[PDB]
């Protein structure tokens, strides 16, 4: 259900594979534009393994289709991101997400 | 333990009756207790004989009498002024504390609760007028307000009375949506919450949801926020259940409260060009100009750098076009008087729409865009890299 | 264990004397209200705030000892007697005379380290026949018709201390069974004997000289509505301590051996009884027929006949 | 725009109260809400708000408080709770501050130097909401501290430069809005363990040059300056204690070997006489406490100090160095100047300000009061056991933080976990004095009182939370001799609410009555010191239990016997522990117990005492019949017959152990004979012989919830102590009727041994 709209191309050569760790820089936001998260405020990139079930599916399945240095807008589905319960306190139930993700390094 | 007092001939030689006189404070408090309970029972009977069914109106409804009595009783519990001597203030505090204790130990808090119960069965002054008369109908609101003020004054400072009548919070939070006494009910609930931690033990999710719905229905009130603050901590100790309830039921949706964000300062640049088409003198209704970029940065500090280009209209035939008033985060396309393009979307009235283009990408360095403008039949157009 | 012994017997061995320089520089208005006056006012407001139990108030317990230790061949005995009056006037004109009364009244008869620290301040402020401070206290008590001071004094006197024989013999049996460390508060047989002596010395200094006004105000608090008799309470405590002395002596009958505990716990009660007797002597010293008749129609005769009975055999 | 709120008073007040609510929902150590609140506002919007100059003031203070609350508050409180407990290891780096520079005309700087003291570590988790299933988010959201401290220093310099000239436009409106939140943030940053030596030097030069204390500051500003100076004194006290420990290391190193050397010398050169035993009793007798007390005393001209006279002079030098390091004849100077200067300048409202000022002045003037208060709370362990004690301190801090929060399900679970961890930690046993110095027993007790409150006889909710504390206190009192004395102080309180947890065989261990018994168990000193303000209370509880059965039991469905045999048995067990100690009955406790029991005859069972039932024979037979007949029980249930049998056996065992003695004092005493006569008149001998002679079966196993063989042991002890065996025909008849059948039943074993 996660869809990708590229913003800046990343030469489409190196793609994330199973058994690797990816370094991203993302500024998430709700559907109405209300920003609920960002990785540039804390000035530390987000490092996460691919296929270890540590991030949400709407993020991992979308990042597995990007390239190094490629900026993208990942639009997710409530069922693939948080479901009918959302995140208690932040994400309301049945909410879609938008992630402005840039790939800094692919290890 | 009670030993009944029987009058008899023999008796027991161990009685030893010792006299003990009470102070003027205690005597006056007892007498005003009797007076107010008599008047309040009279008012309760007069209201019940009218609210139970349609009966002949030969009832005693002391409207003005009970109004004056409430206005006197409210001032009877007036806290001492802060511009007072310390010893006199402490004396007045002790006096009002003893008064509150003597008034609570007679159970008239439940009496004023029954009074406001029997008075809440109506809906408005118009509803009460055609049933109890014009004077009673027009004074029902003031009587309710005075009763709620008296109820708040009876629990303003005592730690015993609040923990005693906390069991009635199920009714206060229910009537909180009366819309004609919400201020009084909110003040009473706040004063009972900031004093006894025992009252916080019975606050369930329904009450918190009702308070949040009140905040959503009656607008932005700064007292509901104080009530929610007092619900989180009472006396140096926190309640994680209520904290989690507040955080999960108040600000997931972001509709309330007032949100906030950190945006960038954007500006615009335009040459001394003006294009006005009408009947008569025209200017070929055809224009075109290019734009290139030398150096750019996607994220300079925290957000994507604003970079748009297009054509902006005016208001009438004068400068200062309408839009984001000034010095904001609104450039071209953020209003109905401008049309811009930024590489990915077409902006018109702060609403973006994505469009297809060969190798659609943001305006990186060394990018040449060309804006064309015909006025009459077609509209503005953009060509990226030709 | 080394640092424990060091902190136990090396640091707190009276290695400082600042209780006079501090209060001296605390009263200079270098430029209103003096700093010491502000402190006294703070303590008075804290003692006047209506509560249900006098709190610990470590600040008060720490400063009421410094203000107490601040106070104390013809010219050598007159210069010190005048400097004592000067040191007492250094703080009794700033509200301490009323602050002590309010602190005693705000305890409503609870023997604690707050009354035990304010009674020593009263002693230091009324050392000698300070008729001026006596009159200030009397005028304060008469202008603010409070009973919570006299009833607090009665409640304090009702629960001061009595030599109990059961706990003494129990501690003796414990010592015989094993070398148990000695209890600090008089082997846990006489509780706060110093507090009792200080309370009765305060009651004595309140009537020292021949202050007939206070001698009569201690018997009948004219102006109030629930007056309590302090002379009868003193007589009752004297009778209690007399019965205690008689029982403690009856324990030591037949055995012609008085051990160290049998000497110390006996001398403590001897001093307490001597202080109570001096207090009664000061109560009836001036020819006040009120206190004369009050002592006549009381239970003092039982106490004195018990004392005669114990003396005739102890001698 | 944010700054436009300056004119709009409604939105300004509403957003101020919104920030107050944001801080209140995450005020205490609650981090699930703080991780949400961080994104709810921002990461860098807080920095922008604290750095901006044109703020409405209320919003500036609110943003400062929110920034303190979401990140800094938790670790600041965790580090401030352990501020009066000076635990210091014996590392070689610890043995380096023994100089504590005070001579050669210098005094050092506060907070400058080396700590080598155990302090809770800090760690913050990264706030990320795209990561599913966060591990625990246990501590705090991450926040860059270097940028924050640099900005704080810069803003403090700008603020003091602005205040020096006394303009008419302070940041945020008035001057308090400018100064109070900034100095508050600086204070919590200084608390939480930042501003290393070089930075602390500049922070000092901000105020010290002889500034900030010389300006005309308002009351809320000087109120925070007081806390700043209080921390500046606390760090100096900690440095003094660390230097004391560093010197004591070498002192003990030079003292212990010298003592052993003189012992070896005096043992080699024996010259056995009548005084050598008096000289050498100190080595075996006189435990190390009084040993060191008597070997460390030289303040007078001479005492019985041993031959190591060299170390006496070095201890005198160190003591004089400590005295000159304290105020006894430069921080105390200017603190004492400023404290009196403010009060002389103006009368001061807000009594908390004058209170803090005067406590600071008194601390500066006394000097050694902080030492005499803190040295009992100091401790040193080793250089090897560090991680274990650090984990113990972290668990104790979590215990205290949970104490500071109202009790709930998750709170109870975390407290149970922490209690388990501190029980399993090894330091709990190797250093029992450390727990007492840390006040673990008082913390656990003040946690337990919160649960035991609320009601008295209408709710005993959170029973596992009640129990875990009791079992921890039981273990704590068990492994020591002094911890029993410590818990004996609180024994008085828990006897008032000892009625909880009974009438249910789910906690045969953890119980307030059981912790009282454990505190008073096996110590003659405490057994004697157990006077009588509570024995009459226990006897009244026993009488009430013997008069009224449990409403919980009659609700469960028990046959509603006219009395309760469970809480009575528990009270009898506690009374047995109080009266009988180390095999010898405490005479005074036994006497007062008999007196109370005979004064309140309802404590005895109604079948034994009263104008109704006959005595123990019929009582025990009826109890056996009730145990056999399931129609008089709960249709693991409480066997009423077994409970009655256990109650009567416990009462008889109490009376037996309460008997005077084995006739050592009874031979020549009168009151002992009187107590024995009272016991004999209360319990007939033939009844005891009949109860002994029941000859229980010997059973494919069976259920032992009936006439247990231990019930006979109480009768045997009562017979031996109250009556004894001194008559030939009596001994023979007892052996015939009550011993031979049980002996045969015991001897008839081949393999089926279900009852040992």
């Amino acid at each position: 259900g996660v869809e990708i709209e590229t913003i800046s191309p990343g030469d489409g050569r190196t793609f994330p594979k199973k058994g690797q760790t990816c370094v991203v820089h993302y500024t998430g936001m709700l559907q109405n534009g209300k920003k609920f998260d960002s990785s540039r405020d804390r000035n530390k990139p987000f490092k996460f393994r691919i296929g270890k079930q540590e991030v949400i599916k709407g993020f991992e399945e979308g990042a597995a289709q990007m390239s190094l240095g490629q900026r993208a807008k990942l639009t997710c589905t409530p069922d693939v991101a948080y479901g009918a319960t959302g995140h208690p306190g932040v994400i309301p139930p049945n909410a879609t997400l938008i992630f402005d993700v840039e790939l800094l390094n692919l290890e | 333990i009670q030993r009944k007092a029987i009058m008899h001939h023999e008796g027991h030689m161990d009685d030893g009756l010792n006299l003990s006189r009470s102070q003027h404070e205690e005597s006056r408090t007892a007498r005003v207790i009797r007076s107010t309970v008599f008047l309040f029972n009279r008012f309760i009977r007069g209201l019940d004989a009218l609210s139970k069914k349609v009966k002949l109106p030969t009832i005693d409804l002391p409207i003005e009498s009970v109004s004056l009595s409430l206005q006197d009783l409210i001032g009877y519990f007036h806290p001492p002024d802060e511009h007072l001597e310390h010893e006199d203030k402490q004396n007045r505090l002790r006096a009002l504390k003893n008064r509150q204790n003597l008034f609570q130990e007679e159970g008239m808090i439940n009496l004023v609760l029954e009074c406001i119960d029997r008075l809440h069965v109506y809906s408005s002054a118009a509803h009460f007028a055609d049933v109890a008369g014009r004077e009673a109908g027009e004074s029902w609101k003031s009587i309710l307000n005075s009763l709620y003020e008296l109820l708040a004054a009876l629990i303003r400072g005592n730690r015993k009375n609040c923990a005693q009548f906390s069991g009635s919070l199920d009714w206060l939070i229910s009537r909180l949506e009366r819309l004609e006494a919400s201020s009084g009910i909110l003040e009473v609930l706040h004063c009972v919450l900031v004093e006894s931690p025992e009252a916080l033990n019975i606050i369930k999710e329904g009450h918190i949801k009702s308070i949040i719905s009140l905040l959503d229905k009656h607008g932005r009130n700064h007292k509901v926020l104080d009530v929610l603050c007092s619900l989180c901590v009472c006396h140096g100790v926190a309640v994680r259940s209520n904290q989690h309830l507040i955080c999960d039921n108040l600000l997931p949706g972001r509709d309330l409260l007032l949100q906030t964000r950190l945006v960038n300062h954007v500006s615009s640049m335009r040459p001394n060009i003006f294009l006005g088409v009408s009947e008569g003198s025209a200017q070929y209704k055809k224009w075109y100009y290019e734009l290139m970029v030398d150096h750019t940065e996607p994220f300079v500090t925290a957000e994507a750098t604003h970079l748009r280009v297009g054509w902006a209209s005016t208001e009438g035939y004068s400068p200062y076009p309408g839009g984001g008033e000034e010095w904001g985060g609104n450039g071209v396309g953020d209003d109905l008087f401008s049309y811009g393009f930024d590489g990915l979307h077409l902006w018109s009235g702060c609403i973006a729409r994505t469009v297809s283009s060969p190798n659609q990408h943001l305006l990186r360095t060394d990018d040449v865009i060309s804006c064309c403008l015909d006025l009459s039949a077609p509209s503005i157009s953009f060509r990226i890299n030709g | 264990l080394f640092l424990q012994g060091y902190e136990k017997s090396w640091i707190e061995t009276e290695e400082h004397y600042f209780e006079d320089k501090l209060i001296e520089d605390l009263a200079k208005p270098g430029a209103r209200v003096d700093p010491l006056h502000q402190l006294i006012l703070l303590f008075s407001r804290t003692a006047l705030t209506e509560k249900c139990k006098l709190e610990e108030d470590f600040l008060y317990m720490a400063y009421a000892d410094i203000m107490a230790k601040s106070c104390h061949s013809f010219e050598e005995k007159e210069m010190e007697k005048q400097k004592l009056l000067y040191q007492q006037a250094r703080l009794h004109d700033r509200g301490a005379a009323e602050m002590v009364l309010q602190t005693i009244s705000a305890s409503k008869g609870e023997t604690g380290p707050m009354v035990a620290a304010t009674l020593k301040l009263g002693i230091a402020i009324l050392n000698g026949g300070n008729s001026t401070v006596q009159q200030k206290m009397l005028d304060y008590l008469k202008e603010k018709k409070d009973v919570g001071f006299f009833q607090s004094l009665a409640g304090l006197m009702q629960s001061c201390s009595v030599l109990d024989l059961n706990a003494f013999e129990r501690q003796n049996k414990a010592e015989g069974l094993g070398m148990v460390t000695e209890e600090g508060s008089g082997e846990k047989v006489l509780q706060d004997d110093e507090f009792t002596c200080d309370l009765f010395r305060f009651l004595q200094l309140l009537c020292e000289g021949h202050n007939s006004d206070f001698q009569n105000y201690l018997r009948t608090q004219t102006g109030n509505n629930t007056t309590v008799n302090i002379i009868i309470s003193t007589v009752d405590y004297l009778l209690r301590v007399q019965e205690s002395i008689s029982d403690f002596y009856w324990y030591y009958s037949g055995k012609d051996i008085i051990d160290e505990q049998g000497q110390r716990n006996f001398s403590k009660a001897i001093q307490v009884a001597k202080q109570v007797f001096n207090t009664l002597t000061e109560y009836i010293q001036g020819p006040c027929t009120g206190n004369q008749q009050s002592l006549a129609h009381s239970r003092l005769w039982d106490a004195v006949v018990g004392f005669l009975h114990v003396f005739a055999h102890m001698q | 725009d944010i700054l436009e709120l300056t004119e709009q008073e409604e939105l300004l007040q509403f957003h101020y109260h919104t920030l107050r609510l944001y801080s209140a929902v995450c005020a205490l150590g609650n981090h699930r809400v703080a991780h949400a609140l961080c994104s709810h506002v921002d990461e860098p919007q807080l920095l922008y708000a604290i750095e901006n100059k044109y703020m409405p003031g209320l919003l500036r203070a609110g943003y400062y408080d929110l920034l303190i609350d979401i990140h800094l508050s938790s670790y600041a409180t965790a580090r401030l709770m352990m501020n009066n407990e000076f635990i210091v290891p014996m590392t070689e780096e610890t043995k380096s501050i023994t100089l504590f520079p005070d001579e050669n005309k210098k005094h050092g700087l506060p907070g400058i130097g080396l700590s080598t003291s155990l302090r809770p570590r800090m760690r913050f988790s990264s706030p990320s909401f795209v990561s599913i299933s966060n591990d625990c988010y246990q501590y705090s959201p991450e926040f860059p501290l270097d940028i924050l401290k640099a900005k704080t220093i810069q803003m403090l310099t700008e603020a003091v430069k602005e205040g020096s000239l006394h303009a008419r436009d302070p940041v945020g409106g008035t001057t308090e809005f400018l100064f109070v939140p900034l100095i508050k943030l600086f204070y919590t940053l200084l608390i939480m363990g930042i501003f290393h030596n070089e930075d602390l030097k500049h922070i000092l030069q901000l105020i010290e040059p002889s500034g900030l204390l010389q300006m005309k500051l308002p009351e809320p500003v000087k109120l925070q300056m007081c806390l700043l100076l209080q921390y500046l004194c606390d760090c100096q006290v900690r440095h003094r204690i660390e230097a004391i420990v560093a010197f004591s290391d070498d002192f003990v190193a030079k003292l212990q070997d010298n003592q052993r050397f003189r012992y070896n010398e005096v043992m080699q050169a024996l010259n056995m006489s009548a005084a050598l035993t008096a000289r050498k009793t100190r080595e075996f007798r006189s435990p190390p406490q009084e040993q060191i007390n008597m070997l460390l005393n030289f303040k007078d001209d001479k005492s019985e100090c041993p031959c190591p006279e060299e170390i006496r002079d070095q201890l005198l030098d160190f003591h004089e160095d400590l005295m000159t390091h304290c105020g006894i004849e430069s921080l105390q100077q200017l603190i004492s100047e400023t404290m009196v200067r403010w009060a002389q300048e103006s009368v001061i409202e807000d009594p908390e300000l004058v209170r803090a000022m005067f406590v600071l002045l008194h601390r500066q003037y006394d000097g050694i009061g902080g030492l005499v208060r803190a040295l009992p709370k100091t401790y040193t362990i080793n250089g090897v056991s560090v991680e274990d004690t650090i984990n113990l301190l972290a668990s104790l801090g979590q215990i205290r933080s949970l104490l500071s929060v109202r009790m709930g399900k998750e709170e109870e679970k975390l407290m149970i976990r922490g209690l388990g961890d501190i029980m399993n930690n090894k330091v709990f046993y190797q250093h029992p004095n450390l727990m007492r110095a840390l006040g673990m027993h008082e913390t656990v007790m003040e946690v337990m009182v919160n649960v035991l409150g609320g009601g008295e006889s209408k709710e005993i909710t959170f029973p596992k939370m009640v129990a875990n504390c009791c079992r921890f206190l039981c273990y704590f009192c068990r492994i020591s001799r002094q911890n029993q004395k410590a818990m004996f102080d609180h024994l008085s309180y828990l006897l008032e609410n000892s009625s909880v947890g009974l009438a249910s065989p789910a906690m045969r261990g953890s119980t307030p009555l059981d912790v009282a018994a454990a505190s008073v168990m096996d110590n003659n000193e405490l057994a004697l010191a157990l006077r009588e303000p509570d024995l009459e209370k226990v006897v009244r509880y026993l009488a009430g239990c013997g008069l009224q059965s449990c409403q919980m039991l009659v609700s469960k469905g028990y046959p509603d016997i006219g009395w309760n045999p469970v809480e009575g048995e528990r009270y009898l067990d506690f009374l047995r522990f109080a009266v009988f100690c180390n095999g010898e009955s405490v005479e005074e406790n036994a006497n007062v117990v008999v007196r109370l029991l005979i004064r309140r005859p309802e404590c005895f069972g109604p079948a034994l005492r009263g104008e109704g039932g006959n005595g123990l024979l019929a009582a025990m037979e009826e109890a056996i019949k009730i145990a056999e007949d399931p129609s008089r029980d709960g249709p693991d249930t409480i066997h009423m017959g077994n409970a009655i049998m256990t109650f009567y056996a416990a009462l008889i065992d109490l009376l037996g152990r309460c008997a005077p003695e084995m006739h050592l004092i009874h031979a020549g005493k009168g009151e002992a004979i009187r107590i024995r006569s009272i016991l004999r008149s209360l319990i007939p001998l033939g009844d005891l012989v009949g109860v002994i002679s029941i000859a229980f079966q010997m059973p494919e196993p069976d259920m032992s919830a009936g006439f247990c063989p231990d019930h006979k042991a109480a009768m045997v002890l009562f017979l031996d102590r109250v009556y004894g065996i001194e008559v030939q025909d009596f001994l023979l008849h007892l052996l015939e009727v009550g011993f031979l059948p049980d002996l045969r039943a015991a001897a008839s074993l081949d393999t089926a041994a279900l009852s040992x």
Side-chain angles (χ1 to χ4, degrees), chain D residues 29 171 173 316 437 460 486 516 549 607 624:
Chain D
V171 178
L316 291 172
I460 316 185
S549 323
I624 293 183

Side-chain angles (χ1 to χ4, degrees), chain D residues 39-103:
Chain D
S39 88
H40 280 134
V41 281
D42 258 357
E43 204 281 332
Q45 153 192 328
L46 298 164
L47 298 149
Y48 175 82
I50 67 168
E51 199 183 359
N52 198 16
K53 263 67 180 179
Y54 311 90
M55 291 299 297
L58 283 181
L59 261 45
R60 183 172 181 261
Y63 273 117
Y64 266 95
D65 295 1
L66 182 60
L67 159 70
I68 304 304
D69 273 49
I70 50 190
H71 322 295
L72 311 188
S73 88
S74 69
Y75 181 59
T77 305
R79 195 176 173 100
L80 203 65
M81 282 183 177
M82 304 293 184
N83 196 84
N84 49 10
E85 304 170 2
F86 308 83
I87 299 178
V88 45
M90 306 312 299
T91 61
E92 291 281 50
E93 199 203 29
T94 303
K95 315 174 202 176
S96 60
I97 49 185
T98 175
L99 82 169
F100 52 103
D102 196 24
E103 57 97 19

Side-chain angles (χ1 to χ4, degrees), chain D residues 452-584 586-708:
Chain D
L452 287 177
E456 287 80 9
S457 197
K458 76 181 183 323
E459 52 91 12
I460 316 185
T461 190
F462 296 132
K464 300 177 165 187
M465 186 74 268
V466 172
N468 280 104
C469 316
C470 300
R471 84 191 34 156
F472 172 82
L473 292 176
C474 279
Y475 210 157
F476 165 81
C477 95
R478 261 164 40 191
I479 50 151
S480 98
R481 184 180 181 170
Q482 329 192 341
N483 304 358
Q484 303 225 336
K485 184 197 297 95
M487 291 301 303
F488 204 61
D489 319 336
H490 314 76
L491 170 143
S492 159
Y493 146 76
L494 48 95
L495 283 193
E496 181 77 10
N497 49 18
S498 57
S499 170
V500 305
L502 306 179
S504 79
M507 39 188 63
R508 200 59 185 179
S510 323
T511 315
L513 199 63
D514 294 32
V515 88
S519 87
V520 82
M521 177 187 68
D522 282 358
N523 251 4
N524 315 60
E525 49 273 20
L526 286 198
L528 285 161
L530 178 57
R531 288 183 178 85
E532 198 249 335
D534 53 340
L535 306 181
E536 76 279 23
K537 160 204 300 171
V538 179
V539 168
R540 253 188 322 273
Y541 291 173
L542 175 55
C545 171
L547 210 52
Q548 282 78 216
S549 323
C550 273
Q551 316 323 311
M552 290 65 59
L553 289 210
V554 318
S555 88
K556 300 307 267 290
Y558 293 101
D560 185 73
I561 316 184
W563 57 288
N564 188 18
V566 192
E567 319 165 309
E569 190 270 326
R570 297 290 331 123
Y571 300 145
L572 292 174
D573 197 339
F574 170 68
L575 286 172
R576 172 251 172 272
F577 269 115
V579 152
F580 203 68
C581 166
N582 282 123
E584 301 84 9
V586 187
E587 298 315 298
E588 305 91 342
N589 298 14
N591 291 166
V592 292
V593 157
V594 184
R595 260 54 155 278
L596 289 172
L597 256 49
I598 66 155
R599 284 295 101 91
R600 320 216 174 93
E602 299 97 30
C603 316
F604 314 112
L608 155 72
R609 191 264 159 193
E611 284 60 26
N614 38 6
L616 259 55
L617 262 191
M620 289 276 301
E621 304 319 303
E622 280 137 23
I624 293 183
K625 310 262 177 90
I626 294 303
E628 270 306 315
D629 162 70
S631 88
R632 288 265 176 82
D633 283 314
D636 199 73
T637 188
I638 289 293
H639 315 264
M640 303 311 298
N642 172 82
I644 292 178
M645 272 181 291
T646 318
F647 175 85
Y648 281 139
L651 176 60
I652 291 301
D653 196 10
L654 163 73
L655 292 185
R657 305 185 189 266
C658 176
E661 207 48 50
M662 48 71 68
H663 316 298
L664 179 135
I665 66 154
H666 163 274
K669 196 71 89 193
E671 53 262 13
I673 292 184
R674 171 189 329 181
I675 294 301
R676 189 195 196 187
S677 88
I678 290 184
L679 298 183
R680 285 175 156 175
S681 87
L682 268 36
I683 308 300
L685 162 62
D687 202 357
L688 294 148
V689 191
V691 171
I692 294 162
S693 47
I694 292 187
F696 55 91
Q697 69 275 0
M698 208 286 299
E700 183 259 341
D702 265 352
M703 172 54 60
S704 290
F707 179 77
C708 167

Side-chain angles (χ1 to χ4, degrees), chain B residues 200-201 215 220-223 225-226 228-229 232-233 236-241 243-248 250-252 254 256-262 302 325, chain D residues 1-2 4 11 13-15 17-18 20-22 24-33 36-37 39-42 44-45 48 63 401 403-406 411:
Chain B
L200 281 80
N201 291 332
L215 180 63
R220 294 184 175 85
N221 197 337
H222 86 91
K223 305 179 180 181
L225 265 53
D226 278 11
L228 298 193
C229 275
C232 297
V233 296
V237 67
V239 296
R240 301 291 172 87
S241 87
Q243 288 186 175
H244 297 159
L245 281 184
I246 292 297
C247 168
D248 292 352
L250 183 56
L251 74 170
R254 283 136 171 87
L256 225 49
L257 317 97
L258 294 175
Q259 289 301 136
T260 185
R261 202 188 179 182
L262 189 76
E325 68 98 19
Chain D
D1 194 350
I2 177 75
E4 293 199 19
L11 288 188
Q13 177 183 179
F14 196 71
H15 198 229
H17 285 232
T18 308
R20 280 186 59 252
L21 183 55
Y22 281 180
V25 298
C26 79
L28 262 64
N30 190 2
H31 314 118
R32 187 206 76 88
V33 267
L37 256 301
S39 88
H40 280 134
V41 281
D42 258 357
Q45 153 192 328
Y48 175 82
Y63 273 117
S401 309
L403 151 70
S404 161
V405 185
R406 197 195 69 169
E411 294 87 296

Side-chain angles (χ1 to χ4, degrees), chain B residues 70 130 355:
Chain B
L70 285 176
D130 54 338
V355 291

Side-chain angles (χ1 to χ4, degrees), chain B residues 163-246:
Chain B
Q164 188 81 216
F165 98 111
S166 87
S168 316
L169 285 177
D170 258 308
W171 175 87
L172 285 168
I173 312 172
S174 62
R175 294 289 166 81
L176 193 60
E177 203 52 29
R178 263 300 187 268
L179 167 57
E180 72 262 350
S182 87
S183 57
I185 307 148
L186 194 65
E187 175 189 0
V188 168
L189 159 76
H190 179 65
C191 87
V192 71
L193 278 177
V194 184
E195 192 62 32
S196 87
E198 192 267 349
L200 281 80
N201 291 332
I202 77 172
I203 295 298
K204 306 307 174 183
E205 183 179 3
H207 311 328
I208 286 183
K209 287 202 61 180
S210 198
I211 294 181
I212 295 180
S213 50
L214 164 67
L215 180 63
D216 205 300
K217 282 180 171 59
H218 284 48
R220 294 184 175 85
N221 197 337
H222 86 91
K223 305 179 180 181
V224 177
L225 265 53
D226 278 11
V227 170
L228 298 193
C229 275
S230 87
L231 270 183
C232 297
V233 296
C234 52
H235 297 268
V237 67
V239 296
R240 301 291 172 87
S241 87
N242 285 326
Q243 288 186 175
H244 297 159
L245 281 184
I246 292 297

Side-chain angles (χ1 to χ4, degrees), chain D residues 75 79 122 149 188-196 231:
Chain D
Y75 181 59
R79 195 176 173 100
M122 60 175 180
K149 54 204 279 185
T188 177
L189 285 181
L190 185 58
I191 283 191
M192 75 183 313
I194 73 170
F195 304 139
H196 57 283
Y231 180 80

